[PDB]
Amino acid sequence: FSALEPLVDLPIGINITRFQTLLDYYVG
Amino acid sequence: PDPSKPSKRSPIEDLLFNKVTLADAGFIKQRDLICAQKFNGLTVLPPLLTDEMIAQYTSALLAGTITSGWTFGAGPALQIPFPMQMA
């Protein structure tokens, strides 16, 4: 058990739909 | 009653004030518990008879029913040797 403390908000009104790494990698 | 103890409660009344883990949310005292409900317009008035009295109404009614039998609840307490009241 480990909790994930926030890092930053970055108020960005943008609509994301995709992503990927570059240079492990368990997408859930 | 136990003389040694401060509260003057019997060795069984003490086994009873410990098991019932309660909390008076009307602390004249100043994170302990929800007892801070006292902070929203609610209050908990204290009972008129402190549990030092209730436990001293019971020392009587227990000292009268040992030394008198059933007589003290019908008139003046009239003493009577215990092993004869039991007879």
Added chain:
Amino acid sequence: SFELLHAPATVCGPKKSTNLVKNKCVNFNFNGLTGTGVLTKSNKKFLPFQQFGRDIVDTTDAVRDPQTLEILDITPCSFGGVSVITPGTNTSNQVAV
């Protein structure tokens, strides 16, 4: 030429620094988030991103000073019920409160 439609504003002008946060004396009558109570210092350990602290039922009883560190736990002002003890206006007119 100001901009205000999109992702929250950057520019603005809040106040600051009323005073010396005013540990005890039920005075410290706000902090960041608006609170009204006795507001002084505490001894909690707010996980240094966490700022205020609820109790079991959603009432914030702790806050950190914004400009400093200052984990201040708050406590409500005071109150009760003034009850008036009287011998009965037939006997006398003095009351205990």
Added chain:
Amino acid sequence: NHNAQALNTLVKQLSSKFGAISSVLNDILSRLDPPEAEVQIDRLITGRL
């Protein structure tokens, strides 16, 4: 238990909005002006009562 339970359900029903934009009255007063506040506050009062 039953007493602390009903005395806790009472408190935690203060933060329900019963159909107001928020539960906080200070808010709805610093925010929206008297008449359009009178509406919301009437809902919160019916509920909290």
Added chain:
Amino acid sequence: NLITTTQSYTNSFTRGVYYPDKVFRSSVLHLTQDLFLPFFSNVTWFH
């Protein structure tokens, strides 16, 4: 270059839970409603 690698499918166990808000709390058991990674679900172990 294209240094690629493999895939998998693993059982995302009791983890993936984040402080849902910046509110301190002590010895409580809160009951949130946020977006979490449901327990014992499937993660796609990319290599």
